[PDB]
Design a protein around this ligand. Structure first.
Ligand SMILES: [Cl-]
Ligand SMILES: [Fe+3]
Length: 187
C-alpha cells in the first residue's frame, strides 16, 4: 500500500477512504498518514466548534460505512471520562494545542481505585492510538490558556461507550452526541 503525504485535510479524507476500503485496518499505516498530515487551521476551522463548558464532538466525515472522522474541541481545562472504545480502533491526532492522555487498565470485578498506568503529553501533529486490548484512557486539555483541537478516527463507528468511575472501576454506558455534523450545528 503506497502511502503518500496528505496535502490537505480533504486529501487526508480521500486517503482514509482508500485505507478503509477493505474489511481490516492497518493501524501503523493509518497512524502514519494521520501523523503526516500537517495541521492547517484554515482547512478545519469549519468543524472546530467549541462549547464553553465541555469538549465538543464535530463530525467531519462518515467514512465508507467503516469509520467516523471527527474533530473534538477542548476548552481550557476540558477533559473526558476514563473510557473504552466499544471494540473499535481509536486514532487521535492533535491539530492544535496539547492533550494529556492517561492510560488505565481494565478494572477487576472488585471495587477498587483505578490507578493510572502511565501518562503522556500529546503534542501538535502527533497521532496516538488506542483500542480496548491496550486499555482505557482519559484525555484532558490541562492548559489554562490554550484550547486544543484533535482529529479522531473511530473504526467501526460507534455512538456509545462506557465511562469508568476512577474511585471504584464501575462503568456506566454513555451515549455520545455530535455537536455538529459536516460544519452544521446539530442541537
Ligand atoms: Cl477518544
Ligand atoms: Fe478515547
Amino acid at each position: 500500500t503506497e502511502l503518500l503525504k496528505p496535502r490537505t485535510l480533504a486529501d487526508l479524507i480521500r486517503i482514509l477512504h482508500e485505507l478503509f476500503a477493505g474489511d481490516e485496518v492497518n493501524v501503523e499505516e493509518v497512524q502514519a498518514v494521520l501523523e503526516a498530515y500537517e495541521s492547517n487551521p484554515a482547512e478545519w476551522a469549519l468543524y472546530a466548534k467549541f462549547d464553553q463548558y465541555r469538549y465538543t464532538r464535530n463530525l467531519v466525515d462518515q467514512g465508507n460505512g467503516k469509520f467516523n472522522l471527527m474533530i473534538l474541541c477542548w476548552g481550557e481545562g476540558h477533559g473526558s471520562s476514563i473510557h473504552d472504545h466499544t471494540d473499535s480502533h481509536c486514532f487521535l491526532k492533535l491539530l492544535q494545542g496539547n492533550l494529556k492522555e492517561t492510560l488505565f487498565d481494565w478494572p477487576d470485578k472488585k471495587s477498587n481505585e483505578m490507578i493510572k498506568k502511565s501518562e503522556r503529553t500529546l503534542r501538535e501533529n502527533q497521532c496516538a492510538y488506542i483500542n480496548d486490548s491496550i486499555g482505557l484512557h482519559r484525555v484532558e486539555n490541562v492548559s489554562h490558556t490554550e484550547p486544543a483541537v484533535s482529529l479522531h478516527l473511530f473504526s467501526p463507528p460507534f455512538d456509545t461507550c462506557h465511562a469508568f468511575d476512577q474511585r471504584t472501576g464501575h462503568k456506566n454506558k454513555v451515549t455520545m452526541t455530535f455537536h455538529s455534523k459536516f460544519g452544521i450545528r446539530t442541537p
